Amino acid sequence: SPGTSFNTTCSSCTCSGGLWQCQDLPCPGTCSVQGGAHISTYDEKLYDLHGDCSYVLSKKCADSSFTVLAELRKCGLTDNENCLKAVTLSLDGGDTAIRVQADGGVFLNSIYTQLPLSAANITLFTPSSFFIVVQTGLGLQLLVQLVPLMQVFVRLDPAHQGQMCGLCGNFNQNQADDFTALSGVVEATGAAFANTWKAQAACANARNSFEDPCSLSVENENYARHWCSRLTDPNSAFSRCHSIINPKPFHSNCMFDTCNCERSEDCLCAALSSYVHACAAKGVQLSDWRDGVCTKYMQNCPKSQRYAYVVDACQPTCRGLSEADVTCSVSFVPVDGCTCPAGTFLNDAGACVPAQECPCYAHGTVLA
Amino acid sequence: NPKPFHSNCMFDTCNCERSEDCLCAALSSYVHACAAKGVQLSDWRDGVCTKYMQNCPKSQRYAYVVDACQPTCRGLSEADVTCSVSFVPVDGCTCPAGTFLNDAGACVPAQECPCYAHGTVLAPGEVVHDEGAVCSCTGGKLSCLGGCAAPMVYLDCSNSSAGTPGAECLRSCHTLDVGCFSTHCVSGCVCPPGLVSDGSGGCIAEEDCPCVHNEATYKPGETIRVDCNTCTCRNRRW
Amino acid sequence: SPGTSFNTTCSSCTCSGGLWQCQDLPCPGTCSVQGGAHISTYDEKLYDLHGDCSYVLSKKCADSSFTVLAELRKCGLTDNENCLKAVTLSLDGGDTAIRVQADGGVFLNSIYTQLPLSAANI
Amino acid sequence: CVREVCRWSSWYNGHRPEPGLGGGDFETFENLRQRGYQVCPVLADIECRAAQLPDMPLEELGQQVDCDRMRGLMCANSQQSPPLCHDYELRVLCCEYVPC
Amino acid sequence: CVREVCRWSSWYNGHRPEPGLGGGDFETFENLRQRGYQVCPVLADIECRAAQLPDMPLEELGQQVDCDRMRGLMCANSQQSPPLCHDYELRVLCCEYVPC
Ligand SMILES: *[C@@H]1O[C@H](CO)[C@@H](O)[C@H](O)[C@H]1NC(C)=O
Numbered sequence: 001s002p003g004t005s006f007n008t009t010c011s012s013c014t015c016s017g018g019l020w021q022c023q024d025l026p027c028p029g030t031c032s033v034q035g036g037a038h039i040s041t042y043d044e045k046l047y048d049l050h051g052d053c054s055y056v057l058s059k060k061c062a063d064s065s066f067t068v069l070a071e072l073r074k075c076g077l078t079d080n081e082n083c084l085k086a087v088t089l090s091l092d093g094g095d096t097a098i099r100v101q102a103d104g105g106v107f108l109n110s111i112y113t114q115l116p117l118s119a120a121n122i123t124l125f126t127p128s129s130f131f132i133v134v135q136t137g138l139g140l141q142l143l144v145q146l147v148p149l150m151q152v153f154v155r156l157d158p159a160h161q162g163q164m165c166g167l168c169g170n171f172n173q174n175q176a177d178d179f180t181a182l183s184g185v186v187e188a189t190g191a192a193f194a195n196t197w198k199a200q201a202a203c204a205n206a207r208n209s210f211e212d213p214c215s216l217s218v219e220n221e222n223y224a225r226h227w228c229s230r231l232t233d234p235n236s237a238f239s240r241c242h243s244i245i246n247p248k249p250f251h252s253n254c255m256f257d258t259c260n261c262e263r264s265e266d267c268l269c270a271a272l273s274s275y276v277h278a279c280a281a282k283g284v285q286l287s288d289w290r291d292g293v294c295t296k297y298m299q300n301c302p303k304s305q306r307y308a309y310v311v312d313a314c315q316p317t318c319r320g321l322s323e324a325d326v327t328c329s330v331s332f333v334p335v336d337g338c339t340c341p342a343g344t345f346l347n348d349a350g351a352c353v354p355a356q357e358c359p360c361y362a363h364g365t366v367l368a
Numbered sequence: 369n370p371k372p373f374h375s376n377c378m379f380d381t382c383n384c385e386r387s388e389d390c391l392c393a394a395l396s397s398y399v400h401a402c403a404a405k406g407v408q409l410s411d412w413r414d415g416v417c418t419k420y421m422q423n424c425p426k427s428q429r430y431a432y433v434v435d436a437c438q439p440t441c442r443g444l445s446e447a448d449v450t451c452s453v454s455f456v457p458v459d460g461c462t463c464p465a466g467t468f469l470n471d472a473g474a475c476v477p478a479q480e481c482p483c484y485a486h487g488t489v490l491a492p493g494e495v496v497h498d499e500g501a502v503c504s505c506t507g508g509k510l511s512c513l514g515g516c517a518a519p520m521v522y523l524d525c526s527n528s529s530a531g532t533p534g535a536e537c538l539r540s541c542h543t544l545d546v547g548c549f550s551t552h553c554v555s556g557c558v559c560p561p562g563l564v565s566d567g568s569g570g571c572i573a574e575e576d577c578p579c580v581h582n583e584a585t586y587k588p589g590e591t592i593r594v595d596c597n598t599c600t601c602r603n604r605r606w
Numbered sequence: 607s608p609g610t611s612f613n614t615t616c617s618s619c620t621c622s623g624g625l626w627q628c629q630d631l632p633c634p635g636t637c638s639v640q641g642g643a644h645i646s647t648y649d650e651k652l653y654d655l656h657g658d659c660s661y662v663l664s665k666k667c668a669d670s671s672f673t674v675l676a677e678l679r680k681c682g683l684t685d686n687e688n689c690l691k692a693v694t695l696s697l698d699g700g701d702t703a704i705r706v707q708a709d710g711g712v713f714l715n716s717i718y719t720q721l722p723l724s725a726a727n728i
Numbered sequence: 729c730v731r732e733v734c735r736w737s738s739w740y741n742g743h744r745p746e747p748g749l750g751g752g753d754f755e756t757f758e759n760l761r762q763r764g765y766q767v768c769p770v771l772a773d774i775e776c777r778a779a780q781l782p783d784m785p786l787e788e789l790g791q792q793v794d795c796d797r798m799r800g801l802m803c804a805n806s807q808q809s810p811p812l813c814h815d816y817e818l819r820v821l822c823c824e825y826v827p828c
Numbered sequence: 829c830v831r832e833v834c835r836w837s838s839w840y841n842g843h844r845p846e847p848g849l850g851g852g853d854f855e856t857f858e859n860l861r862q863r864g865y866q867v868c869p870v871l872a873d874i875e876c877r878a879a880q881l882p883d884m885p886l887e888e889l890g891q892q893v894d895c896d897r898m899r900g901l902m903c904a905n906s907q908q909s910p911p912l913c914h915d916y917e918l919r920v921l922c923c924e925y926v927p928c
Pocket residue numbers: 005006007
């Protein structure tokens with residue numbers, strides 16, 4: 001009824017004047033690399049990248065304030081079988097380098113650094129066992145997925161709009177300019193654009209891939225079809241996001257991954273997790289979508305932890321409840337993963353005990 | 369003058385509950401102050417404070433003079449910003465010389481320890497394919513290939529401190545601009561300063577690098593048509 | 607013999623003029639707290655301190671560029687049985703904190719940090 | 729009476745992984761049986777490791793290895809970058825029941 | 829033939845430390861024998877842990893507590909700042925011989 005309003009995640013529209021009067025709330029841009037090959041830029045120009053090098057994922061190409069790098073590595077017989085393998089946030093013109101590997105190992109200036117870590121305004125912590133958050137004050141936040149495989153997500157305070165360069169595009173609300181290279185022209189296809197952003201001159205240029213791996217194996221065909229079809233099913237858990245995000249690119253990603261992936265379940269669940277996480281970024285809480293699928297990621301949790309579909313904050317810790325924590329002052333999209341249940345906390349030993357079993361800490365002293 | 373140190377030792381030991389601890393602490397303090405002044409006291413724990421020899425972590429041994437860096441395998445792989453700090457030589461438990469501690473913390477000789485490329489473990493005495501190059505983890509050091517003829521001359525990482533931009537970070541018609549990233553130097557033929565390579569083993573000035581558009585390569589002086597307009601390649605630009 | 611010189615770690619002296627011509631090479635000063643009670647200042651003024659608090663061990667007092675703090679705690683029946691229990695390098699006006707405890711645990715902004723670490727030139 | 733008596737086995741390195749794309753290490757219980765290595769029909773848990781790096785665990789390596797109590801250990805060259813494997817081995821746990 | 833059979837013993841929390849300056853926790857073998865707890869005269873290792881906090885090792889506690897496998901566990905209030913101890917207990921490893 002006219003007089004009413006409705007605000008999306010990115011804009012608010014009021015029903016008036018016989019039309020929708022739409023203003024925009026500021027929206028942090030979101031790049032992502034999913035499946036080790038597919039890239040969704042800030043302008044949402046989805047494109048596939050089958051490369052084997054280190055690529056400048058994003059960079060404020062006026063200066064060298066920050067430089068997110070991604071190392072994509074070929075993972076099989078086929079040239080188009082890739083996995084993300086690292087995320088190397090260079091910073092201060094290379095003075096600092098936070099390198100998140102694919103096993104979860106985090107290297108601060110090429111030195112192992114456990115998590116969390118809070119220094120130089122940079123905060124590294126794991127909301128759950130599946131994700132690592134690298135929050136910086138320079139504007140960008142990295143949210144990196146390790147389970148079931150390696151994917152990367154990048155968030156930008158919209159202040160950097162129309163300033164960045166790199167694979168994820170200049171973030172200026174224009175999909176036709178995303179392939180602007182350093183030579184002033186829009187590149188043609190994905191790989192031709194990416195081969196201008198390689199880190200090392202000795203890398204091999206990425207190649208355009210037409211051959212669908214789905215055509216190879218009929219059993220791979222039926223497996224990938226019967227599972228990835230759970231995306232576009234209007235009765236599925238995912239339907240709640242269909243009216244917001246078109247799931248066709250995500251279904252293509254799931255098909256291509258599962259058919260091409262040697263670990264079909266891993267890439268399949270990576271695609272489903274990617275769809276869920278994108279939708280939850282848009283502001284929909286997809287839940288209970290792992291019915292009869294991807295349950296080996298339910299079970300494989302570290303002991304005394306448990307799965308959770310909506311993890312939307314820091315991890316409750318005995319140290320934190322004793323003396324506060326810088327960690328819990330970071331807003332990130334609610335990801336899923338393994339965490340301690342509510343009413344419990346993990347002590348410095350990491351085991352999950354109730355509040356009664358964990359001690360208060362004064363001056364760093366364990367006070368039982 | 370050791371009189372204040374003797375008074376400290378007396379007061380500590382007569383007051384300390386584990387008076388051995390405070391006694392050895394005072395003797396260590398005198399030794400360290402003397403080493404600060406520039407004297408190397410050694411073998412001073414004759415029949416005294418030997419429980420600090422014995423309690424060493426496994427695979428480590430005591431050392432009277434630790435005058436610099438702790439030798440790490442990661443460092444011999446990819447250098448170490450930690451290890452260029454001048455501190456007065458202190459004593460303590462350390463890995464024995466010629467041996468290094470792996471990421472597990474145990475101490476092994478150089479031959480048992482992998483070389484770390486991009487932070488990836490690579491077992492010793494193994495040759496791997498990477499970036500069209502053939503590399504090997506020999507005794508903890510990583511050595512890779514893939515004595516020249518054209519103006520570009522060889523560059524070897526053996527002399528340079530670990531971490532220099534090697535042949536992989538070669539000034540090139542593409543990486544001249546983006547700036548190269550590599551934690552592992554590689555030896556190879558590199559153009560003399562003032563030029564770059566064409567990618568095929570030649571040397572070209574930086575103001576004639578061919579422009580690349582849509583998988584193609586265009587020499588300077590070539591023109592292309594994009595949509596309704598025409599661009600021309602000059603100084604690696606359109 | 608004449609013409610000879612000998613250099614200490616803090617100075618260099620040449621035997622000439624029948625005397626020692628001594629110049630002073632730069633010397634980094636050295637404070638220390640030993641035994642948990644005794645303090646050797648930068649001026650080498652040894653004195654004992656039996657305290658139960660956290661004391662500002664050293665601080666460039668024009669501003670707050672750094673502040674090395676030492677917490678000294680009583681350790682026995684008698685009031686003069688003390689132990690150093692922490693060393694809290696407060697930095698950037700307290701914006702950064704590196705706390706080395708007595709058992710070896712090092713805390714960067716009250717977060718456990720294994721060693722080595724290398725950030726913010728630290 | 730009858731009580732379970734159980735113990736670990738020794739280290740079994742029956743192959744040296746081959747350079748290339750199809751190469752790697754394939755240490756399987758069926759291959760162990762064929763080669764003459766004793767394979768217990770029943771087990772509780774097994775442990776895999778790299779033979780040349782006996783300290784740093786499997787997850788610290790970061791390489792793609794699948795190692796399970798029912799099958800054994802497998803590392804394929806093509807799945808890692810560089811496309812190679814390390815030289816792995818594994819050991820098993822055998823438990824029988826002895827009269828008290 | 830005779831085979832070694834070792835085994836841990838359970839937790840022996842035999843004291844509640846008293847607040848004050850001279851109080852503390854003194855879990856000593858002879859006191860354990862006097863209180864009725866079975867303590868094996870021959871042993872290899874013992875393990876101490878804070879009774880209320882069974883997860884973090886003794887070292888992470890940072891308190892001056894000394895355990896020796898021949899004599900027991902001691903914590904005195906004065907040595908620690910704050911002038912109090914935690915609550916501790918230990919276990920012993922008892923080993924004997926059984927005919928093959
Ligand atoms: C969005 O609209 C709803 C419904 O009118 C309202 O409750 C909510 O406060 C709005 N969000 C704002 C104003 O940020």
